[PDB]
Every structure is written in structure tokens, then in C-alpha cells.
Amino acid sequence: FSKACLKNVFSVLLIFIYLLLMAVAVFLVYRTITDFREKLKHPVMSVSYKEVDRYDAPGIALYPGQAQLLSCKHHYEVIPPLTSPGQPGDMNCTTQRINYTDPFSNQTVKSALIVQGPREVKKRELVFLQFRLNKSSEDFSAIDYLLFSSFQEFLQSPNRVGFMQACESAYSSWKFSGGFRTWVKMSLVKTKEEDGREAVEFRQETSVVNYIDQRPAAKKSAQLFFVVFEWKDPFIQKVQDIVTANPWNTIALLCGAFLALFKAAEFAKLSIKWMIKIRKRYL
Amino acid sequence: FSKACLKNVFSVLLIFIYLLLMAVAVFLVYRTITDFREKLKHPVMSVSYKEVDRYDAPGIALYPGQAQLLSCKHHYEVIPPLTSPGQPGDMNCTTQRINYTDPFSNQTVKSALIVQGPREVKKRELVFLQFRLNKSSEDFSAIDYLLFSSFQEFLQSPNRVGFMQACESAYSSWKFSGGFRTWVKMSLVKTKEEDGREAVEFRQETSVVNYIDQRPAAKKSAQLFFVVFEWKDPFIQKVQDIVTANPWNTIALLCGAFLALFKAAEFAKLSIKWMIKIRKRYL
Amino acid sequence: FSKACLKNVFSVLLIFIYLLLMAVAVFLVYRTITDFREKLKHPVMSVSYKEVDRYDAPGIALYPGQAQLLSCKHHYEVIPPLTSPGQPGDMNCTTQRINYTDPFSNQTVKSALIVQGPREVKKRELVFLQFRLNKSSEDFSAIDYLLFSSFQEFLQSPNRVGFMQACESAYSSWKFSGGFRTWVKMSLVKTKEEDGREAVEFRQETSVVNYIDQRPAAKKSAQLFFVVFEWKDPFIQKVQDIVTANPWNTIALLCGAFLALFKAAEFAKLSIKWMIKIRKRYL
Ligand SMILES: *[C@@H]1O[C@H](CO)[C@@H](O)[C@H](O)[C@H]1NC(C)=O
Ligand SMILES: *[C@@H]1O[C@H](CO)[C@@H](O)[C@H](O)[C@H]1NC(C)=O
Ligand SMILES: *[C@@H]1O[C@H](CO)[C@@H](O)[C@H](O)[C@H]1NC(C)=O
Ligand SMILES: *[C@@H]1O[C@H](CO)[C@@H](O)[C@H](O)[C@H]1NC(C)=O
Ligand SMILES: *[C@@H]1O[C@H](CO)[C@@H](O)[C@H](O)[C@H]1NC(C)=O
Ligand SMILES: *[C@@H]1O[C@H](CO)[C@@H](O)[C@H](O)[C@H]1NC(C)=O
Numbered sequence: 001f002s003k004a005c006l007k008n009v010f011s012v013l014l015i016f017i018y019l020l021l022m023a024v025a026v027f028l029v030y031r032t033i034t035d036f037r038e039k040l041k042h043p044v045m046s047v048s049y050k051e052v053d054r055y056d057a058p059g060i061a062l063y064p065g066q067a068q069l070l071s072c073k074h075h076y077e078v079i080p081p082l083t084s085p086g087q088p089g090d091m092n093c094t095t096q097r098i099n100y101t102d103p104f105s106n107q108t109v110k111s112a113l114i115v116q117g118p119r120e121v122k123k124r125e126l127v128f129l130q131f132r133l134n135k136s137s138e139d140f141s142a143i144d145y146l147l148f149s150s151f152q153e154f155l156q157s158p159n160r161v162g163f164m165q166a167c168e169s170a171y172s173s174w175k176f177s178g179g180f181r182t183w184v185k186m187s188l189v190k191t192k193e194e195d196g197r198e199a200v201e202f203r204q205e206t207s208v209v210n211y212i213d214q215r216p217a218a219k220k221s222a223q224l225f226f227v228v229f230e231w232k233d234p235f236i237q238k239v240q241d242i243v244t245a246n247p248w249n250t251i252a253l254l255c256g257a258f259l260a261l262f263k264a265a266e267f268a269k270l271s272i273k274w275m276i277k278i279r280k281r282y283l
Numbered sequence: 284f285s286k287a288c289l290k291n292v293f294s295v296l297l298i299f300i301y302l303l304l305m306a307v308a309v310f311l312v313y314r315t316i317t318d319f320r321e322k323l324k325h326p327v328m329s330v331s332y333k334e335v336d337r338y339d340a341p342g343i344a345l346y347p348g349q350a351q352l353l354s355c356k357h358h359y360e361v362i363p364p365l366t367s368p369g370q371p372g373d374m375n376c377t378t379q380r381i382n383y384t385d386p387f388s389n390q391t392v393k394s395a396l397i398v399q400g401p402r403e404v405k406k407r408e409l410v411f412l413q414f415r416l417n418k419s420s421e422d423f424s425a426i427d428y429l430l431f432s433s434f435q436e437f438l439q440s441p442n443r444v445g446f447m448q449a450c451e452s453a454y455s456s457w458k459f460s461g462g463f464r465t466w467v468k469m470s471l472v473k474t475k476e477e478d479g480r481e482a483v484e485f486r487q488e489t490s491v492v493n494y495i496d497q498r499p500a501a502k503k504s505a506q507l508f509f510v511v512f513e514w515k516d517p518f519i520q521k522v523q524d525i526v527t528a529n530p531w532n533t534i535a536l537l538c539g540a541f542l543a544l545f546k547a548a549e550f551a552k553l554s555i556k557w558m559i560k561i562r563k564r565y566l
Numbered sequence: 567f568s569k570a571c572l573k574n575v576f577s578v579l580l581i582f583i584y585l586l587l588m589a590v591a592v593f594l595v596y597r598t599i600t601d602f603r604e605k606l607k608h609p610v611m612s613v614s615y616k617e618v619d620r621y622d623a624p625g626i627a628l629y630p631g632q633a634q635l636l637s638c639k640h641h642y643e644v645i646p647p648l649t650s651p652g653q654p655g656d657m658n659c660t661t662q663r664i665n666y667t668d669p670f671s672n673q674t675v676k677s678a679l680i681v682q683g684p685r686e687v688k689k690r691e692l693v694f695l696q697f698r699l700n701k702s703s704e705d706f707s708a709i710d711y712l713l714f715s716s717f718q719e720f721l722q723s724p725n726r727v728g729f730m731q732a733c734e735s736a737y738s739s740w741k742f743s744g745g746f747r748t749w750v751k752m753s754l755v756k757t758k759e760e761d762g763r764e765a766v767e768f769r770q771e772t773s774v775v776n777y778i779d780q781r782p783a784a785k786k787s788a789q790l791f792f793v794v795f796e797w798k799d800p801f802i803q804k805v806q807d808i809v810t811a812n813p814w815n816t817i818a819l820l821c822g823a824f825l826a827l828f829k830a831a832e833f834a835k836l837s838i839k840w841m842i843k844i845r846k847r848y849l
């Protein structure tokens with residue numbers, strides 16, 4: 001009746017209390033393990049993928065030098081035929097300009113043009129950029145570009161100079177050539193270091209397409225650069241410490257270890273009792 | 284004797300029965316967990332690789348437009364020197380032609396030429412294709428291609444039109460340029476969605492090689508396209524829900540949780556008995 | 567006092583002995599499982615990443631044929647402007663030459679030039695190579711290259727001929743074109759087979775940049791090849807058998823299975839005692 005129900009309730013709450021205590025002990029051991037692992041250098045890391053409905057707009061830092069940005073536009077899955085190559089027109093995108101001292105030599109000041117990238121991967125959104133360089137005594141006509149995760153973070157950055165140097169430290173620098181159109185499909189990788197900081201890196205796939213110049217031969221001295229930026233897939237890659245990335249495996253291992261210790265203690269007590277009984281029976 | 288053996292057999296079969304019951308309960312809990320997980324959106328997914336002796340022949344959907352397929356051939360690890368570039372000859376491969384309305388605009392009807400790809404990765408099998416385009420008023424001379432997993436599935440597809448649209452929805456579209464030879468190394472990725480459907484995607488690595496035209500200057504108006512398709516490695520990538528991909532980790536976690544619950548119940552019973560005995564001894 | 571301390575010490579050492587025995591049994595079962603898995607063909611494999619402070623210098627096997635290696639140099643993050651393209655000069659790197667019969671046809675003897683690659687990824691170390699080919703009646707001007715893990719291993723190899731054939735068996739062969747500069751970012755993948763042997767493979771990302779030739783028109787007959795080699799990131803990928811790569815998950819599963827078996831045995835004994843008591847009470 002009432003007494004049996006009260007006893008059952010007391011037993012259930014005591015079970016819950018002991019479960020809470022066991023969870024606390026297991027969590028403390030896991031916290032100790034993670035604290036030890038965080039101070040290791042070069043640990044083994046695991047990989048995971050996560051799908052996104054829409055991407056945060058990335059930042060494309062271009063280094064045209066003397067080349068003038070002729071045109072930048074947003075398109076969906078297709079680029080309409082060029083109205084007049086080599087002519088300025090239709091320049092309407094979110095762009096910023098930043099000068100910063102190169103972190104590797106300190107002799108050269110890099111001037112970068114930051115462009116907001118595309119967001120809608122599931123609609124094949126494209127950012128199409130056209131540059132024109134009048135003349136250059138240098139060989140290997142190319143424009144260098146760099147990719148970073150967020151344009152908004154750069155916009156609200158307190159420094160905006162150390163941000164660009166930190167971006168240059170990342171391994172996301174490439175070049176695209178003149179006289180060609182480069183289709184770039186970018187992929188996002190995020191690595192979680194033991195300090196808690198996130199390092200963002202970009203993979204790329206490229207398609208290089210020759211450009212046919214029907215402009216007059218007198219106008220062929222200038223060089224035209226065409227580049228297209230889009231997201232390859234809605235999957236973001238995440239590299240994280242193998243123990244920290246999957247806490248549940250370590251929790252299961254620790255629970256098994258504790259239960260094994262309890263079992264071993266019970267067997268030791270049983271063996272002690274057995275030996276005591278054997279000694280008593282013998283003498 | 285007989286009685287002891289019978290008792291031992293009964294105990295062993297009872298142990299097996301209880302093990303079956305525990306396995307049934309653990310499987311039911313795992314099934315409930317997976318049913319909950321399947322209705323989540325954008326979960327964390329794990330990656331695995333599997334080696335294959337031979338590949339299923341893929342489907343290469345090319346969009347030449349006005350370009351004529353001059354030649355297609357299968358080679359092993361090397362391509363013999365061209366007998367006569369720009370001339371038709373040696374066109375012998377499994378090819379099919381399909382017209383379908385583009386799923387993104389519905390104004391344009393895409394005409395695709397499907398080619399059966401290579402299978403023997405361990406023999407470096409190559410599919411070599413040569414196209415020729417007489418003239419084109421458009422710039423950016425390129426031919427678009429798409430990759431899908433199985434040519435046989437397309438061959439036996441009941442629709443053959445929705446199949447191509449679904450393939451176009453996948454993120455496996457690229458282009459290759461004229462006046463160059465493009466060596467394409469493809470890699471296969473298969474993603475298992477929670478609905479049970481498999482999404483197939485292709486990664487690519489490209490080598491672009493300039494083509495030297497020794498044909499007469501009067502014949503240089505036409506543009507030549509050369510493309511090579513082969514498998515990069517015998518490893519197929521598989522991306523799957525992290526809980527579903529490794530059921531054994533979840534099984535171990537659930538077994539540990541159940542044993543912890545049993546241990547907690549035993550400790551609660553022991554504590555109840557201890558307190559009852561203490562109360563009896565005190566008064 | 568002394569007796570209680572001695573009893574506690576004996577109990578603790580017996581607990582340790584039983585824990586050692588349980589660990590031995592679990593390790594034996596895991597060893598049996600791994601021995602069974604090692605004889606499987608095409609198993610499921612997991613992936614992990616490991617960071618490195620510095621890379622072991624790789625081996626770049628180039629196949630110039632009739633092209634002469636004009637220049638090879640080591641640079642950090644930037645290549646100074648060319649003093650005089652097409653002219654020999656500044657050839658100072660660790661290079662070796664090897665002839666070996668091709669393992670696929672045995673009719674052709676491949677002559678390879680091995681170059682020691684870069685090591686310091688965190689300093690963006692670059693290996694820059696320039697070749698010059700006087701004339702060639704063949705089309706598709708390209709130079710084939712292959713990548714292998716260690717130059718030192720090739721240097722101390724007892725055979726040096728079977729080593730190159732085994733390297734050619736690996737899926738790390740590409741080409742780079744003349745009249746262009748190819749920036750190659752390489753990534754290292756190591757696969758552990760069940761036999762214990764390690765297979766090394768290379769991924770690559772390429773940037774192709776057009777080269778502007780201001781040399782006199784009489785000197786344009788020769789073709790110039792420019793290639794740059796560097797490491798993309800300090801992360802090495804490792805693909806290994808899923809059971810062997812994460813032994814701790816299997817250890818946790820086996821510990822849970824053993825504890826479940828012990829629990830089932832205890833429940834069977836309790837049920838046997840219950841039924842015996844019920845039979846005694848009834849009659
Ligand atoms: C495009 O440019 C025009 C003028 O250059 C501007 O008024 C318009 O807002 C721009 N649209 C977008 C989407 O950038
Ligand atoms: C940045 O440097 C460029 C020259 O490279 C020049 O426009 C000026 O010095 C700087 N621009 C601004 C807006 O500070
Ligand atoms: C360049 O200047 C920066 C900041 O003053 C310094 O940290 C770096 O060591 C310098 N590099 C040299 C002197 O090579
Ligand atoms: C530089 O480019 C402009 C295009 O904005 C062109 O009008 C001008 O003629 C070019 N300079 C020379 C010297 O041709
Ligand atoms: C190659 O083509 C010829 C005729 O064009 C045909 O008879 C032969 O069967 C073809 N072989 C292959 C392997 O496609
Ligand atoms: C497909 O379209 C092409 C024109 O693009 C033309 O051959 C014809 O209309 C269609 N071919 C077939 C076989 O239905």
C-alpha cells in the first residue's frame with residue numbers, strides 16, 4: 001500500500017542518486033583524461049562531415065597589383081555570354097581594400113581586394129570576376145588569391161591587419177592565370193586545436209578553359225583574367241582530437257573499466273573468503 | 284553423473300536464453316536510438332574507405348553541342364601517338380544519346396552523349412576521347428562533362444530523363460578546354476542519407492597538357508578537344524551517419540549503461556539494507 | 567593494526583592479479599579477432615590525420631626524356647624573377663639518375679631523374695625546376711613526374727630498380743605541360759594493409775599559370791617547362807583497418823560482452839535457485 005509505494009520511491013531515488021554519483025565520477029575521469037591530452041603535441045585526429053543548408057559568405061582576398069577589376073557579378077549555375085570583353089561594366093558587389101605588411105619578409109606591403117563570396121550551394125551560386133592588365137614587363141601572368149571563412153568576421157575585426165596576416169599564415173593561397181577562365185570549387189575544413197582555437201583551411205578543384213579573343217589585334221596587348229568561385233558541395237569537413245571528437249567511446253571505455261574493477265574486487269573478496277574457509281576446514 | 288550433466292546443460296541453456304534476452308533488449312534500444320536519429324536534419328557523419336578489385340563502369344555524360352566526337356578508345360597505362368589529329372577514325376565504344384529538359388531553367392534542352400567509363404583501376408585503364416569543332420562565335424571554348432556511378436543503371440532506367448536531371452543535381456560537373464589534353468583522375472564518394480537513399484559524388488584531379496598543332500595553318504580554324512578518363516585509386520569513400528556507421532560503439536555504450544544501472548540498483552538495495560540494519564541496531 | 571594492513575595489502579594485490587588476468591584474457595580475445603580480420607580481403611578502413619613539424623624530404627622522379635634540366639633551386643614562399651629564361655644556370659640540388667625497365671610492358675626502359683623535395687612546410691619551402699627542350703616531332707608537350715615518400719630510402723635501397731617499379735605501381739603519377747608554370751601542392755596518404763606493409767600515395771592540387779615569352783622569335787622553337795613543388799599542409803592522412811586503427815573501441819566492446827556474460831551467469835544461477843525453492847515449497 002502506502003508503505004510499499006514509499007519504499008519503492010525511496011529505492012528509485014537512491015538508484016538515481018547513485019547513478020548521478022557514477023556519472024560524476026566518470027565525467028571527472030574523462031575531464032582528467034582530456035586535460036592530459038590537451039597538453040600533448042601532434043596527436044591523432046579524427047574526421048567528420050556536416051551538411052549545411054546555406055554557407056556563410058566567405059572572403060576572397062585577391063592581389064591584382066596593377067590590374068583593374070573590370071567586373072564582378074553573382075550568377076546561378078550559368079554565366080551569360082560576355083557583352084564586351086575587356087570593357088568595364090556591371091561592377092556591383094561587396095568589396096573592401098586593405099593594405100598590410102607581409103608577415104614573412106616585412107619588406108613588401110601587400111594590397112588586397114576582399115570580395116564577398118557565394119552562400120547558396122544548393123542553387124549553384126557563382127561569383128564571376130573579370131580583371132584587365134594593360135601591360136607588364138614581368139613574365140608568368142597570374143593573380144594570387146586567398147580564401148578565408150567569413151567576410152563578416154573581417155568586416156567587424158578590431159584590427160583588420162593582423163587578421164590578414166593570420167589568413168596568410170593559413171594554407172589557402174593559389175593563383176589563376178590570364179588568358180584563361182578558372183572555375184574554382186572550394187571546400188571547407190575546420191581543425192580544432194587543443195587550445196580551443198579553430199583553424200580554417202580551403203581545398204580547391206579547378207577547371208581551366210582557354211579564352212578566345214576576337215578583339216582587334218591592336219587591343220591584344222592587355223591581358224584579361226576571368227575567375228569563377230562556387231562551393232563544390234554542402235559538406236564541411238571537421239578534424240578534431242580523436243578522444244575529444246568522440247567522447248562517448250571514452251565514456252564507454254571508462255564505464256567498462258570501472259565495472260571491471262568492481263568485478264575484480266568482488267572476485268578478490270570471494271577468493272579471500274574461500275581461502276579462509278579452506279584454512280578453517282583443514283585446521 | 285547424469286544428473287550433474289543435466290543440471291549443467293540446463294544452466295548453460297538458461298545462460299544462453301538470458302543472453303538472447305539481453306541482446307534483444309539492447310537491439311531494441313539501439314533501434315529506438317536510430318529511429319530518433321533518422322529524423323534529425325544535418326547530423327554529424329563519419330568517413331570510411333573500402334578497396335575494390337574492379338570498378339563498376341561509370342557514366343560520363345558529355346555536352347559537346349556542335350562538336351563532333353572524332354574518336355573514343357580504351358587504352359592501358361599509355362596512349363599511342365596520334366595517327367592524324369583532327370581526322371575521324373577508330374570510334375568504337377558504348378555510347379548513348381539522351382535529350383532532357385534542364386531542371387534549373389526549363390528553357391534549355393540539354394543533349395548529352397553518355398560514354399561507358401573504365402573499370403580496371405589496377406591495370407590503369409584509360410578512356411581517351413577526341414572531339415573537333417569546326418567554328419564557334421562564342422568565347423571560352425570548353426566542353427562540359429558530368430560523372431555518375433553506373434552506366435548499367437542508366438541503361439536499364441525506366442525513365443532515362445529524370446535520371447539525367449537527378450545526375451545534374453549532383454555536384455559532379457566540370458569542363459575541359461580545347462587545344463589541351465586533360466587527364467582526369469576520378470574518385471568515388473557515396474553518402475548515405477537518413478532516408479536510406481545513396482547519393483553518389485565524384486572528386487577529380489586534373490593534368491592539363493598543351494597540344495602542339497602541326498596541321499596546316501588553313502586547318503587551324505577548327506578546335507580539337509582531348510580528354511582522358513581513369514580511376515585515381517581503388518579506394519571508394521563512404522560518408523554515413525556516425526551512430527549508424529559504427530553500431531558496435533553504440534552497442535558497447537548501451538551495454539555499459541545497462542550494467543551500470545544494474546550495479547546502481549544493487550548498491551541501492553545494499554544501502555537500504557544497511558540503513559535498516561543500522562536503525563534496528565540503534566533501536 | 568598490522569594484521570588489518572596486511573589483509574588490506576593482500577586484498578589489493580589479489581585485486582591487481584585478477585585485473586591482470588582479465589586484461590590478459592581480453593587481450594587474447596582481441597588478438598584472435600585481429601588475426602581473423604587480417605586474413606579478410608577488402609575490409610572497411612578508417613581515416614585519421616596527424617600533424618608534423620617538418621616533413622621527410624620526398625622523392626620527385628621526373629621523366630624529361632630529351633629535355634635538359636636547366637635549373638633547380640630551393641626558395642621560401644616566393645620565387646624571385648627569372649634572370650634569363652631558357653638559359654642554364656644555378657643548378658644546385660640533390661639529384662640522382664636511374665634507368666629501369668617499365669614493369670607494365672618490358673619493351674621500354676624508363677630513365678628517371680630523382681630530385682630531393684622540400685621539408686619545411688611551415689616556412690613554405692618551394693622546389694623550383696626549369697627544363698628546356700630544343701625540338702620534338704611529338705605533340706602534347708609534357709613531362710611526367712612521380713612522387714614517393716622518402717628520398718633517403720631510395721638512396722639506401724639495396725636494389726634501386728625494384729624500388730622504382732614499386733613506386734610506378736603506386737597511384738602518384740602526373741604530368742606538367744610546357745609553356746606554363748605549374749604550382750603543385752602535395753599531400754601524403756599512408757595506407758596500412760593487413761600484411762603490415764605501408765602503401766604511400768600522394769594527392770595533388772595544381773595551379774597552372776601562362777608563361778609570357780619575351781625572348782626573340784628565333785629562340786621560340788625550344789619549349790620551356792617550369793614546375794614548383796611544395797607541401798600543402800602539415801597534415802598526413804592515415805588509412806587503417808577500422809578494428810585495428812581503434813583498438814580501444816573493441817576492448818570496450820569485449821569488456822562489456824564479458825561483463826554481460828558474467829551477469830547472465832549470475833541471473834541463471836539465481837533463476838535455478840528460485841525454481842528449486844519454488845519446487846521445494848510447493849512439495
Ligand atoms: C548592380 O549594379 C547596379 C549599378 O551598377 C546597382 O544599382 C545594383 O544594385 C547592383 N545589383 C546587385 C545585385 O549588386
Ligand atoms: C594602399 O596601397 C595602395 C598602393 O599599393 C594605395 O592605394 C594606397 O597607398 C593605400 N590605399 C589606402 C586606401 O590606404
Ligand atoms: C620583419 O619585421 C617583423 C616585425 O618587425 C619581424 O617580426 C621579423 O622578424 C622581420 N623579419 C626579418 C627582419 O627578416
Ligand atoms: C590602359 O587601359 C585603359 C583602359 O581603361 C586604356 O584606355 C588605355 O589606353 C590603356 N593604356 C595604354 C597605354 O594603352
Ligand atoms: C573497334 O572498332 C572496330 C570497327 O570500328 C570494331 O570492329 C571493333 O569491335 C572495335 N573494338 C572495340 C574493342 O571497341
Ligand atoms: C535530340 O536533340 C538533338 C538536337 O540538340 C537532335 O538530334 C534531336 O532533336 C534529338 N535526338 C534524338 C535522337 O531524339
Ligand SMILES: *[C@@H]1O[C@H](CO)[C@@H](O)[C@H](O)[C@H]1NC(C)=O
Nearest residue numbers: 384385386387388389390391
Ligand atoms: C520550369 O519548369 C519546371 C517544370 O514545369 C518547373 O518545376 C519550374 O518551376 C520552372 N521554372 C521556372 C518557371 O522558372
Ligand SMILES: *[C@@H]1O[C@H](CO)[C@@H](O)[C@H](O)[C@H]1NC(C)=O
Nearest residue numbers: 351371415416417418504505
Ligand atoms: C566542317 O568539318 C568537316 C570535317 O568533317 C570539314 O570537312 C568541313 O570543311 C568543315 N566545314 C567548313 C566550312 O570548313
Ligand SMILES: *[C@@H]1O[C@H](CO)[C@@H](O)[C@H](O)[C@H]1NC(C)=O
Nearest residue numbers: 639640655656657658659660
Ligand atoms: C648553389 O650552387 C653553387 C654552385 O652552383 C654551390 O656552390 C652552392 O653550394 C649551391 N647551394 C645550394 C644551397 O645548393
Ligand SMILES: *[C@@H]1O[C@H](CO)[C@@H](O)[C@H](O)[C@H]1NC(C)=O
Nearest residue numbers: 663664665666675676677678
Ligand atoms: C641510362 O639511359 C640513358 C639513355 O636513356 C643513358 O644515359 C644511359 O644508357 C644510362 N645512363 C647510365 C648512367 O647508366
Ligand SMILES: *[C@@H]1O[C@H](CO)[C@@H](O)[C@H](O)[C@H]1NC(C)=O
Nearest residue numbers: 667668669670671672673674
Ligand atoms: C615483360 O617482362 C616481364 C619480366 O620478364 C614479365 O614479367 C612480363 O610478363 C612481360 N610482359 C609481357 C611479355 O607482356
Ligand SMILES: *[C@@H]1O[C@H](CO)[C@@H](O)[C@H](O)[C@H]1NC(C)=O
Nearest residue numbers: 634654698699700701787788
Ligand atoms: C639545342 O640547345 C642548345 C642549348 O644548350 C642550343 O645552343 C642549340 O642551338 C640547340 N640546337 C639547335 C639545333 O638549335
